[PDB]
Design a protein around this ligand. Structure first.
Ligand SMILES: NC(=O)c1ccc[n+]([C@@H]2O[C@H](COP(=O)([O-])OP(=O)(O)OC[C@H]3O[C@@H](n4cnc5c(N)ncnc54)[C@H](OP(=O)(O)O)[C@@H]3O)[C@@H](O)[C@H]2O)c1
Ligand SMILES: Nc1nc2c(ncn2[C@@H]2O[C@H](COP(=O)(O)OP(=O)(O)O)[C@@H](O)[C@H]2O)c(=O)[nH]1
Length: 308
């Protein structure tokens, strides 16, 4: 086996890198983690050269333009164009090199805005996504479209995984361009240093399902090894384990032991209020998989941010 992991220097990439190094890589597996320095995946010639030099049997595609709510609201053309180029170059290069399996990465924010809850793997194209991230959403939706096209025309086992809001070490902690959990971890840290209050953006009422990067890294390694379906699989925590932004901010405030004031910038966008996903397909395959308790995983992430 030869596994080429694209975008291996990111949050999910370093998590798979840490899990494999901690004793998860089965004998006869060659793990090749690449970044933009190895090949700019928007460039067709650079990607073809990487897939030709590193001839893989299996591919974990993570390379993408990823940003927070406020980054997506700003650059939907960039999120659409840059991702479509990266996805087409990786999927078609893996096809011409003859890769046995390609597991791409999707998101729960790509799902239709007007839908029934909980969301499942069959509802992926049943209506338009949220207006804030339509660019990124459609780029990831077209991965599934391409996966179906390779499978129906050539028999390729090109599949995808649908994780929820991931968090953990080697995250983007830029408050402006980052997500809710790493953006609040840096906020509380600056508030402790400056002696200022914590300003949570929005109302704190939107509900989100969070997944620890290390947990999704273990599920990703399983998906590449035993999940033979072409249809995607939601890699998330249960519907009941959904929390609000207020609750998530409370977990960060407790983990960083912040005793200062917590205010809410009601004027800021809340984005999509809900995107409750059902992990029924995951629970039919892995009913014995145990997730890291949210408070323990937040504390571990907070400790890593203050340490590194
Ligand atoms: N984080 C979440 O909450 C979340 C939720 C759902 C889905 N996901 C999925 O998770 C995957 C990984 O995202 P992440 O959260 O780990 O973000 P990340 O930390 O920013 O990692 C993105 C990776 O992509 C690489 N990359 C960017 N442009 C590239 C290019 N042109 N060519 C090659 N590599 C390139 C980056 O390398 P450099 O630093 O070298 O540029 C980096 O290693 C994405 O496919 C995303 O859809 C994440
Ligand atoms: N990005 C970000 N969102 C925050 C922050 N504090 C609170 N939020 C809330 O988190 C949500 C956006 O989360 P984000 O991970 O960026 O993206 P989303 O899950 O796709 O909507 C909104 O409801 C915001 O009001 C922060 O510091 N950064």
């Amino acid at each position: 086996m030869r596994i080429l992991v694209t975008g291996g220097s990111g949050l999910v990439g370093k998590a798979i890198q840490k899990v494999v190094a901690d004793g998860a890589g089965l004998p006869g597996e060659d793990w090749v983690f690449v970044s933009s320095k190895d090949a700019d995946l928007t460039d067709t010639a650079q990607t073809r050269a990487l897939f030709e030099k590193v001839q893989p049997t299996h591919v974990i595609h993570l390379a993408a333009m990823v940003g927070g709510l406020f980054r997506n609201i700003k650059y939907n053309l960039d999120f659409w164009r840059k991702n479509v180029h990266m996805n087409d170059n990786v999927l078609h290069s893996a096809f011409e090199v003859g890769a046995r399996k390609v597991v791409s990465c999707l998101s729960t924010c790509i799902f239709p805005d007007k839908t029934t809850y909980p969301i499942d793997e069959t509802m992926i194209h049943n209506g338009p996504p949220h207006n804030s991230n339509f660019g990124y959403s459609y780029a990831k939706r077209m991965i599934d479209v391409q996966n179906r096209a390779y499978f129906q025309q050539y028999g390729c086992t090109f599949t995808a995984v649908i994780p929820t809001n991931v968090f953990g070490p080697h995250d983007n902690f830029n408050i402006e361009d980052g997500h809710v959990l790493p953006g609040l971890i840096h906020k509380v840290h600056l508030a402790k240093s400056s002696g200022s209050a914590l300003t949570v953006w929005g109302t704190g009422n939107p509900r989100r399902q969070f997944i620890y990067s290390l947990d999704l890294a273990q599920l990703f390694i399983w998906v590449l090894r035993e999940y033979n379906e072409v249809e995607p699989i939601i890699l998330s925590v249960g519907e009941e384990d959904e929390v609000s932004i207020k609750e998530a901010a409370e977990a960060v405030v407790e983990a960083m032991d912040f005793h200062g004031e917590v205010t809410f910038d009601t004027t800021k966008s809340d984005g999509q209020f809900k995107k409750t996903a059902s992990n029924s397909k995951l629970r039919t395959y892995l009913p014995d998989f145990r997730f890291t308790p949210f408070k323990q995983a937040v504390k571990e992430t907070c400790a890593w941010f203050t340490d590194n």
